[PDB]
Write a protein that binds this ligand. Sequence first.
Ligand SMILES: *[C@@H]1O[C@H](CO)[C@@H](O)[C@H](O)[C@H]1NC(C)=O
Ligand SMILES: *[C@@H]1O[C@H](CO)[C@@H](O)[C@H](O)[C@H]1NC(C)=O
Length: 195
Amino acid sequence: ANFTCAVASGTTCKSAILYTSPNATTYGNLVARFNTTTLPDLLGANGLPDGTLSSAPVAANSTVKIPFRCRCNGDVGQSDRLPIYVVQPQDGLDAIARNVFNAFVTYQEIAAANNIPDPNKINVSQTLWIPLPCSCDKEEGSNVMHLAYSVGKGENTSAIAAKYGVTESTLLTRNKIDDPTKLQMGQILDVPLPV
Ligand SMILES: *[C@@H]1O[C@H](CO)[C@@H](O)[C@H](O)[C@H]1NC(C)=O
Ligand SMILES: *[C@@H]1O[C@H](CO)[C@@H](O)[C@H](O)[C@H]1NC(C)=O
């Protein structure tokens, strides 16, 4: 389930997803859709200056680091009752999960988290808590920021680990990957940033 977290229940820390924006949008809109962080923190997480306007563009298909508060429940780490998603006229949990949130969650996880779904029957304008995966676990005794990462096509665990200043075996043990060569596009990795 989601990302694992083994520290005391109620533990709060800072995590992130590397978000792939389905459409052209702006930092201001992301701040709004997510509501998990303030604008200046979003800008800093993506290495942009103080004077940057909220209208700063994010191109379709490009990535944005989105920070949020993680809460651990004893088993798992989830974004802490945020972000909130309002169901649309022709939305389905699976389409929301996959087409809005990069499949960082499954429709089952969206189901369990909002208690009301036991099957997928939902109403428009209803608010859903989206439990983005996270953790506050340390990495071999050190403090890390956990980043949810969706594997790109043609990527390997070596280059992914290196890009995040992490050891490949760390990436592999943390994500219980027996065989690196089996890495799939769109597989969600828990990357423990040394930071
Ligand atoms: C960019 O995103 C649009 C959807 O908004 C999609 O139709 C197109 O395939 C994407 N292009 C690339 C280069 O991924
Ligand atoms: C991993 O990906 C990078 C970048 O495309 C490539 O240069 C590197 O050689 C790859 N390693 C393997 C094992 O494929």
